[PDB]
Write a protein that binds this ligand. Structure first.
Ligand SMILES: C#Cc1cccc2c1c(C(=O)c1ccc(Cn3c(C)nc4cnccc43)c(F)c1)cn2C(=O)N(C)C
Ligand SMILES: C#Cc1cccc2c1c(C(=O)c1ccc(Cn3c(C)nc4cnccc43)c(F)c1)cn2C(=O)N(C)C
Ligand SMILES: CCCCCCCC/C=C\CCCCCCCC(=O)OC[C@H](O)CO
Ligand SMILES: CCCCCCCC/C=C\CCCCCCCC(=O)OC[C@H](O)CO
Ligand SMILES: CCCCCCCC/C=C\CCCCCCCC(=O)OC[C@H](O)CO
Ligand SMILES: CCCCCCCC/C=C\CCCCCCCC(=O)OC[C@H](O)CO
Ligand SMILES: CCCCCCCC/C=C\CCCCCCCC(=O)OC[C@H](O)CO
Ligand SMILES: CCCCCCCC/C=C\CCCCCCCC(=O)OC[C@H](O)CO
Ligand SMILES: [Zn+2]
Ligand SMILES: [Zn+2]
Lengths: 399, 279
């Protein structure tokens, strides 16, 4: 029949049954959460496009349950197997692509925090990804999906679906090598991006460099905070060279000096020098009065979250304002990494040795072990339709 | 961050004691087993000599760490020796993991599916392992291993060896994720391979079957005692060194790290034990 055969005919009918029911509930409810949202916009498109990918897979699951309940016999017409295989490839790589693009969006939102045609970009990208993956998945519709073999007992035959690999196929090896190398290349980008977001939003600023990294941004993680030190020193040099800003600056403590520096990085010496009254309240250590007067500016209307953070730093002289910043993003980063390492990485680790075993290039004792592993990763990869809807909690839930 | 290291005096007591014991015992047991092989299945014997060479490399670095921890974490010796110490410690850790795993797989295919080609195959595979591991270990030679930092008592400056970690480094963290994941991938292939050996050896229907079954247990003993404690701690500790944790966790995981580092060194003394359970 097959190497891993024994348990696969029991595994998939149970595993895929749970997944079918949970995944149809989770993605169906997610289309209720999406519908009830008319007031993030770009991320919303990727999420809805990701659900569209899940629906395509979920609908094929009844066919796999029956195929495995029939001891691996594809009794329906051949093209329904072509379509089933095709939609599996679509689900997997649209999910890899849409999780990838959600990660990049959030990375740019944290790393570079600076039109309503952002929606036009989410739609533009989603289409590129669909054309790229549906185009690649189309090859599954031109293949001979099934192979007929004599049954072990009786007078019958067994019709396998996308299990047959012509012994020693070279295109198969090149295609499977490309996909795995392209996957871990994509996985490395995702891992780096989500670890930057996490690193940035976990590690609470204790200086002006870390403080301006949250509010203004800064690419990757380097120590050679030394280049940015130069920009701050040049900013302080000018502040002290300004008769309107020097008395206040000199009078302030190091944490409050950073808040003034922050303001200067945002609106410049010119901008900050036009806060005569608020600056006088600071020079006189009238923290609450200064804080209240600072909230009565256009700065507060224009950038409220940064203003609130800087005003708090002026009021308290502590870094508490930067303790739990952008938690929607911090949790998004963890969730995308969970969905990636759980669902996609196991399958992609097991993929190249299993293809080599299935092209015969590996021994019978290993071929049997890697086949068993393969059935487990194929189940892990299917949990994606139940797991990936969790990301919607970024849109709904507040911290 | 180097200021958080003045709180752990434990390592300066632990390493000079434990590394002196490991050095002497190891140099003896390894020097001894090199005479066992000199006064002489054949493929397995090739992996064992190489595995003993990985041990010697690290054993020769032990007197340097003894001196280092003796001088309260001050690398009094030349700074280049620090790169060489780190390099050889990495070689020892992963040449051991590879050669033990390659021994485990030799006995797996020799039990589940049983001369001049095996000797040549074993040398091939052995040279692959050295090239792969020494290739990665060589990156320790191009780093800035040493960092001058103040001492617990006064304004005096000590020189650390491979203790500096750039705050919030994502690539340092990615490397450690790669190595910890690869280790548990390699270890689980080993765990399965060995457990199949002990299962097939427990259910076979006299002396040949009795030694190879008890050998699969030695490879597991070495993995669970020496390598698994360290690779469990490696990630939580790395995170602590990159500033991703609290001071309370920092101290807990750093102390555990000293224990697992000592436990990793016991592999020099525990792996020559495989020589008898086969030859
Ligand atoms: C992912 C992927 C992939 C990417 C590119 C080429 C692929 C694959 C691919 C598969 O790994 C693959 C494996 C099993 C099947 C069919 N399949 C089977 C037999 N059981 C399944 C349980 N869930 C989903 C699909 C299942 C399939 F349609 C594609 C086989 N491919 C292939 O080269 N074939 C010649 C089928
Ligand atoms: C294993 C491994 C590894 C793999 C990849 C990168 C590694 C490491 C690595 C280490 O774990 C590491 C830790 C401590 C030391 C130095 N070290 C110290 C301070 N005490 C030691 C006692 N025994 C052996 C080595 C000792 C080292 F050379 C390497 C540090 N690495 C690193 O990121 N550095 C910036 C040195
Ligand atoms: C015969 C079987 C093989 C054929 C398989 C066909 C796969 C389906 C193709 C696209 C999914 C459609 C959903 C997403 C495509 C629209 C992209 C877009 O612009 O997203 C707009 C967004 O939803 C605005 O809110
Ligand atoms: C960009 C990646 C393309 C993605 C999927 C292509 C999957 C199609 C797999 C085609 C190999 C099937 C096979 O066995 O064909 C033998 C070969 O073409 C000798 O003529
Ligand atoms: C050309 C670029 C990608 C095509 C790779 C997918 C090829 C899958 C089609 C396999 C097939 O049936 O075609 C056999 C042909 O010889 C194989 O080029
Ligand atoms: C064939 C021998 C494989 C060794 C089994 C060790 C298993 C322990 C897992 C990770 C630590 C070792 C990481 C070594 C992986 C190679 C990375 C590298 O950069 O090495 C360069 C190499 O020479 C050019 O490919
Ligand atoms: C697997 C093979 C690599 C094994 C050892 C090299 C580890 C050395 C890592 C030391 C990094 C030094 C650093 O702080 O630089 C950051 C850099 O961007 C990061 O590549
Ligand atoms: C085709 C050319 C490809 C070449 C591209 C390299 C591929 C990196 C491979 C493994 C990671 C090795 C980790 C690199 C070690 C970091 C060393 C470093 O950054 O330098 C020392 C620094 O000054 C701190 O003291
Ligand atoms: Zn097979
Ligand atoms: Zn530390």
């Amino acid at each position: 029949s097959h190497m891993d055969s024994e348990f696969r005919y029991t595994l998939f009918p149970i595993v895929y049954s749970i997944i079918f029911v949970l995944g149809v509930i989770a993605n169906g409810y997610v289309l209720w959460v999406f519908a009830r949202l008319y007031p993030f916009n770009e991320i919303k498109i990727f999420m809805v496009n990701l659900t569209m990918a899940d629906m395509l897979f979920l609908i094929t699951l009844p066919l796999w349950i029956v195929y495995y309940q029939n001891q691996g016999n594809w009794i329906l017409p051949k093209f329904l197997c072509n379509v089933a295989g095709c939609l599996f490839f679509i689900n997997t790589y649209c999910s890899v692509a849409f999780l990838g693009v959600i990660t990049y969006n959030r990375y740019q939102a944290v790393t570079r925090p600076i039109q309503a045609n952002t929606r036009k970009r989410g739609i533009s990208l989603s289409l590129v990804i669909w054309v790229a993956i549906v185009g690649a998945a189309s090859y599954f519709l031109i293949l001979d999906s099934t192979n007929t073999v004599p049954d072990s007992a009786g007078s019958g035959d067994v019709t396998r679906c996308f299990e047959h690999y012509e012994k020693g196929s070279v295109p198969v090896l090149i295609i499977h090598i490309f996909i795995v190398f392209s996957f871990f290349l994509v996985f490395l980008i995702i891992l780096f991006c989500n670890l930057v977001i996490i690193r940035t939003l976990l590690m609470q600023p204790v200086n002006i460099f870390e403080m301006l990294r949250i509010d203004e941004g800064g690419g990757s993680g380097g120590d050679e905070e030394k280049l940015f030190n130069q920009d701050v020193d040049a900013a302080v040099r000018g502040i002290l060279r300004n008769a309107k800003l020097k008395p206040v600056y000199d009078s302030l403590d190091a944490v409050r000096r950073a808040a003034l520096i922050n303001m200067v990085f945002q609106m410049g010496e010119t901008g900050v020098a036009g806060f005569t009254n608020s600056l006088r309240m600071l020079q006189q250590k009238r923290w609450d009065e200064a804080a209240v007067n600072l909230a009565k500016s256009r700065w507060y209307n224009q950038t409220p979250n940064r203003a609130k953070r800087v005003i708090t730093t002026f009021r308290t002289g502590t870094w508490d304002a930067y303790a739990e910043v952008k938690r929607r993003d911090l949790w998004m980063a963890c969730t995308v990494l969970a969905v990636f390492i759980i669902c996609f990485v196991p399958h992609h680790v097991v993929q190249l040795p299993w293809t080599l075993a299935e092209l015969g290039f590996q021994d019978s004792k290993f071929h049997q072990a890697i086949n068993d592993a393969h059935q487990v990763t194929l189940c892990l990869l299917s949990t994606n339709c139940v797991l990936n809807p969790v990301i919607y909690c970024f849109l709904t839930k507040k911290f």
